[PDB]
Design a protein around this ligand. Structure first.
Ligand SMILES: O=C(O)[C@H](O)[C@@H](O)[C@H](O[C@@H]1O[C@H](CO)[C@@H](O)[C@H](O)[C@H]1O)[C@H](O)CO
Ligand SMILES: O=C(O)[C@H](O)[C@@H](O)[C@H](O[C@@H]1O[C@H](CO)[C@@H](O)[C@H](O)[C@H]1O)[C@H](O)CO
Ligand SMILES: [Cl-]
Ligand SMILES: [Cl-]
Lengths: 785, 785
């Protein structure tokens, strides 16, 4: 079974085998953890760069998680073994590593915690994980109850494998003074500069108990012996051996021996995490490891999540949609803008898009993000490929490979901020540039960005692509310096048209004319060179080849140039229906719209690395949700209400059982992708990546707020412009907007020919609520034909 | 049990649990594999840089093996499951992953193969692995026999897990045309230049059968199901499901169904390895996958190993020593010089030392190695930190961090070559330098190297250490440009004294004087600044601190400055006994001599990274065999015969049972280290690193040939100078030397006061056999007091 519980606070799966990849996530200001339903977990923290405290059993690469991450028996996880001392029978919570028969299983994804209930052998177990807001530590609460009528003698063994920490130096031992296990290493390196750089690393891992145990074991191999994780030798014997690790793989295993009366329950607390030294571990222990410490952290964390609850609560005829939107969407949006994906150098397009989502949650964060991003703009007007969030950080990985699209996001996402807040006064703030002495207003910086986009075009008037655009791995179209992007061109026309509208609102009329003319020039170039007759191509290679066209067998159509041609005006009214039909025919699937099709099955080396991905995975033809929601937004922009909703709703798994089993995910987030290549590889199509990091969700939230429910800001007030699916006879929403609350009731009427709006029971004229007082509540009734 | 079998060809362990880390190795011109006794394996190949075809289940770091490498259930390996179709009972060969009760177990390390015999359920299994000489492929032969009296219906399942190949693209499927499983990936990258660089990668892994199977499975998770590796679901059912992998972790599993008569045995052949494409896999199949192909490869491989058999066979009163020296030592030496550790940029000290070993095996390889190494000498005289073996290769890892000792090895190892071969004519060969147009003789290059060592000294006359010397991770003594090395100084005096002796043999008298004077100057500086009263210090830091002294609590004495002071002449007759005693008191252990003591337990940042290793591991205080044999060689140089032999013999595990169990290794190689820190951490002391890559063995072979058995070359012929341990009443050796064979019999006599030598039964005068005819055999009798 799989359903919402606890009044929306949690979401419960009752089989540990039906959906074995399913998972949920938690984060805080400094860490994140992905927890699998069977007890595997991946945890990363910042110090200030990424690191981990629970390691693989081998020397793993520097990485967090892969899409569709597979687990294996020794993957890091969070386990508790229970042993009936009378019978010798054992089981483990949550399910791994023993995989015993259980009488009851629940995995509960929470807004603020992750928990399990299980039962075996008549013993009832509860496990609850949460994090505090500001420190790196896991708070673990275990409850064990004898559910039967006679006393029961049990051994209870936390098993938190530390893994292979380092080939230079790893060890571990029990510390009575810390009250638990302290594993220790030295992170490997070779260069002297790295010794200086690594000085403040938290290269100890602690596992501390509140209640002193009977015994412990710190050596992984001693724990397993021949019995392995299925039946550890250390657990077969009466008492753990109390061994240490001396350049041996360390582990964290404790043992409690209890005789529990009928119906008796006992609670045990632990914390797990990294530390510089034992002193820091003890500081965490004193702050957190108690009933009071756990309750204070929980109260503070629930407060943090509620601070990010957002501006929209809905009550539609679709209860799965209600649950997702009300309870899960805003937390996922909030994570992205609040901690910027836990990177010290966010990709600029990610920083600006994730902060755009924040406009609906905590817009002062958005405001400061624009100020920060623009302070790092180059004097040319160009934006850097990443934005540094800490002095001393550097551009890493894809951010060192030249992509050309960074400036497009500025006005595209500023428009959401300005519409929601009406904070045009941001445009007057003064900020520096990345180099030089010039300090200019936001508005001037934006003009220089749009001038950059206009200058970074070839003689045909089309945008250079270099080693990629929005599609990060699209690296061989323009690497010789001549290739151009179809998508970047259409999106630059959109950006320029939006920014000209701002300039016109600001009385910057010369600018408005200049950018409007820019946008027409690009659109005309696009129509001349990129349009392929039934859809827009994707780009022109360094050697002059148009691709993403009907002559290409793989990558015959890409979604992005279509959505963005719709938004930026390259697609007129006669080309629009060609796009809709071609997308439906070639890209739509039951799991959502694919970003390109057919997927590439081999390298095409004038397009590049994207074509080497497995067909259907990631940018190579998946249902890549971020591209899908750009299409949904383009659809809303032209009033294609039914098609917009249909494709948005496809992003949420369930309630169809086959759908839920095939995507394999709990419906508590939208992943970066569901597997595509639907025609080529049907068996796997729909499978969830399980990756909760995705720019999709800022845009999905915007589409629902402003487009489907149609409650959008303007300089006059709240614009009522709903695009509800026709199946809905009635719906309600509660919209928070500029400090006020709107209780909106939507109802279909066959008495009217045109929408009618009532505010506090009086019919209004027009579609705008203009008189908004902070702290007030308004009743809005919207009757629709 | 653990013993030599097959007339020395193999070495057999009969418990899969007593020595669970034990392992043996195979190599060829392009690959190596370390095979664990329970069925785990690590395999690397060159194309021309390192790569693998069997992956971990996660995204592993670029690495081969760690010292004391731990395994875990999903580590790569080489397995076969047997299922009794009547009972459903299963077991796996060799032992993992099921770990069933077996009725018989043998793991056979071979000179040219690795094999197992096991039995369970009345079924007798044989497994044999070997490699061809020149292609990258594993040749696997499986035999299954019903050892009982009634027919038996069995399913037989090879299980060769491919692992997690790539996050960009991984897959696999069955190919009837190839006749087996083909897994495929694209190695991840981001930079366009890497696409060009990676073009010829063998990114397919094949598992091909000679005999067509009943069924197959390519998806790892489908193979395991809930049952895991202990009881795979695919094996529970009647027939494998014939599944593929589509961006899922692939595997190689086949199934044969057989009804075997009483006493019936069947043979099945497979090959496993990497390929560019199916065409290459089929080429390997046609060449190898047959009884004829396996026999041709085996015959060619045994020939290759016999070509490396070396120059010394011994018959001593110690049968463990005999076995090791005769059967295992020469193959380990041969590996090092023949394939240079499978790196395209060997560390210069490793290249020169490993090639020195070759002087006793195939000296033309040694000769060409000096020619190659010196062609890359810098015009200054300095040697580079590595030697490039392929055009386009680069210096990697430690070779990019400046170390100062590279030139010292030239005359130290040239001396062995000249003594063995008498090829002074090498000195006349003309070779270029790394830059510039100068082409000079070997002799001139050597003079420039020794002038470099003399110039690279401070005002005190001591050698700069920069970021390290022989001790690779000794990186913080001289990183600011002032620190100097105690060891490098004493070894430079040795190098100069040897090279002056060559110059004197070559009538280069000015050079002889110049370098002899250099050596005295350095030795005097060493005695003034480095000698600490009872032993020589290790170095002086940038801030002027002498370390490796009696005032240091950790790192109180280092072995190297003592051995090298003995060799180079810094240690006179009055200081020698102080060194011997201090080494005995502080560094000697039952497992061999430690390289420093007490081990460092925390960073000391004017010594550096070495001090951060776990105490007792690697350079931080292990029994680091390469340093140990430098001491043994220094001992032989002063006639400390008993102490030399004792410490050399300590390098060979066994026959003491406790010793064999504690080191945990088969006695078929000498590892780079046995764990030290004997006083600080007794529990783990002696544990083998299991690393067969080590420069130790060229020197151990030289010590036995020239020092213990005392059969050493000179410009006059064969010098007889034995240092046998006194316990030996008699011994024999067979020495191959300059094309002739010497059958040497050694016998102790109380009738003589001084050694007597007879050649073909006539007493000779002096200690040199001067008349050596190629192809002849001589009988030498050496009577000792
Ligand atoms: O090859 C790769 O590493 C990966 O495919 C990344 O490019 C990708 O990264 C995303 O790829 C999007 C589409 O290319 C891009 O618009 C976002 O800015 C970037 O965060 C992943 O979602 C990161 O999890
Ligand atoms: O920190 C490290 O990576 C390792 O300790 C290496 O330095 C070491 O490498 C050896 O270390 C020796 C002593 O330092 C050195 O003389 C040899 O040239 C070098 O091959 C290993 O034996 C490679 O397996
Ligand atoms: Cl795209
Ligand atoms: Cl040393």
């Amino acid at each position: 079974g799989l359903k919402a519980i606890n009044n929306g606070e949690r979401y419960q799966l009752t089989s540990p085998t039906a959906m074995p990849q399913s998972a949920s996530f938690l984060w805080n200001k400094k860490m994140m953890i992905q927890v699998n339903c069977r007890g595997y977990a991946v945890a990363q923290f910042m110090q200030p760069e990424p690191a981990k405290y629970a390691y693989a059993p081998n020397l793993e690469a520097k990485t967090f998680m892969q899409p569709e991450q597979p687990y294996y028996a020794h993957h890091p996880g969070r386990f508790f073994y229970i042993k009936d001392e009378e019978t010798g029978e054992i089981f483990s919570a949550p399910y791994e590593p023993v995989r015993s028969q259980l009488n009851n299983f629940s995995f509960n994804a929470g807004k603020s915690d992750i928990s399990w209930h299980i039962a075996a052998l008549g013993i009832e177990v509860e496990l609850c994980l949460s994090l505090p807001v500001d420190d790196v530590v896991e708070l673990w609460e275990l409850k064990i109850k004898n559910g039967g009528a006679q006393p029961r003698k049990l051994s209870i063994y936390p098993y938190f494998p530390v893994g292979y920490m380092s080939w230079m130096n790893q060890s571990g031992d029990y510390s009575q003074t810390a009250g638990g296990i302290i594993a220790s290493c030295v992170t490997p390196y070779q260069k002297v500069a790295d010794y200086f750089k690594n000085k403040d690393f938290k290269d100890k891992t602690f596992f501390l108990h509140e209640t002193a145990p009977a015994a412990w074991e710190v050596n992984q191999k001693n724990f397993e012996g021949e019995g392995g994780l299925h039946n550890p030798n250390a657990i077969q014997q009466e008492t753990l051996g109390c061994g240490n690790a001396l350049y041996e793989t360390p582990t964290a295993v404790l043992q409690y021996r209890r005789e529990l009366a009928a119906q008796e329950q006992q609670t045990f607390r632990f914390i797990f995490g990294p530390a510089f030294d034992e002193s820091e571990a003890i500081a965490l222990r004193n702050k957190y490891l108690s009933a009071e410490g756990f309750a204070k952290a929980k109260s503070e964390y629930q407060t943090y999540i509620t601070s990010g609850k957002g501006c929209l609560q809905i009550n539609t005829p679709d209860p799965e949609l209600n649950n997702f939107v009300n309870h899960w969407l805003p937390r996922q949006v909030f994570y992205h803008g609040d901690v910027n994906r836990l990177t010290t150098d966010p990709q600029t397009r990610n920083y600006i898009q994730d902060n755009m989502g924040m406009s609906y949650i905590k817009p002062n964060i958005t405001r400061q993000a624009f100020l920060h991003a623009l302070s790092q703009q180059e004097e040319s007007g160009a934006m850097p490929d990443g934005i540094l969030l800490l002095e001393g950080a550097e551009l890493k990985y894809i951010n060192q490979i030249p992509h050309t699209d960074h400036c497009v996001w500025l006005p595209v996402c500023m428009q959401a901020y300005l519409d929601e807040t009406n904070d045009y006064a941001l445009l007057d703030e003064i900020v520096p540039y990345a180099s030089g002495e010039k300090r200019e207003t936001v508005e001037q910086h934006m003009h220089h960005a749009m001038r950059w986009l206009l200058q970074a075009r070839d003689e045909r008037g089309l945008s250079f692509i270099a080693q990629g655009d929005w599609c990060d791995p699209m690296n061989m179209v323009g690497y010789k310096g001549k290739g151009v992007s179809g998508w970047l061109s259409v999106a630059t026309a959109y950006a320029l048209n939006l920014w000209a509208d701002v300039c016109e609102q600001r009385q910057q009329n010369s600018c408005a004319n200049e950018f409007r003319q820019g946008a027409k020039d690009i659109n005309a170039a696009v129509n001349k060179h990129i349009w392929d007759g039934e859809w827009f191509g994707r780009g022109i290679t360094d050697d002059g080849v148009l691709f993403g066209t009907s002559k290409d067998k793989e990558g015959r159509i890409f979604l992005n140039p279509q959505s963005w041609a719709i938004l930026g005006g390259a697609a007129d009214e006669q080309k629009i229906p060609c796009l809709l039909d071609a997308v439906e025919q070639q890209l739509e699937t039951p799991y959502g719209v694919m970003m390109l099709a057919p997927a590439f099955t081999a390298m095409r080396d004038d397009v590049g690395r994207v074509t080497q991905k497995f067909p259907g995975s990631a940018e190579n033809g998946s249902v890549y949700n971020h591209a899908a929601v750009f299409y949904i937004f383009s659809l809303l922009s032209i009033g294609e209400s039914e098609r917009a909703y249909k494709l948005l709703r496809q992003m949420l798994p369930g309630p169809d059982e086959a759908d839920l089993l095939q995507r394999g995910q709990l419906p508590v987030f939208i992943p970066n992708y569901y597997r595509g290549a639907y025609y080529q590889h049907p068996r796997t199509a729909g499978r969830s990546s399980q990756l909760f990091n995705t720019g999709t969700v800022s845009w999905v939230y915007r589409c629902l707020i402003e487009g489907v429910f149609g409650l959008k800001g303007s300089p006059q007030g709240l614009v009522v412009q709903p695009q509800l699916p026709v199946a809905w006879q009635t719906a309600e929403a509660v919209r928070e907007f500029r400090g006020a609350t709107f209780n909106v009731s939507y109802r279909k009427s066959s008495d009217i020919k045109e929408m009618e709006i009532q505010l506090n029971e009086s019919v209004i004229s027009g579609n705008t609520i203009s008189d908004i007082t902070a702290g007030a509540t308004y009743q809005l009734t919207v009757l629709l034909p």
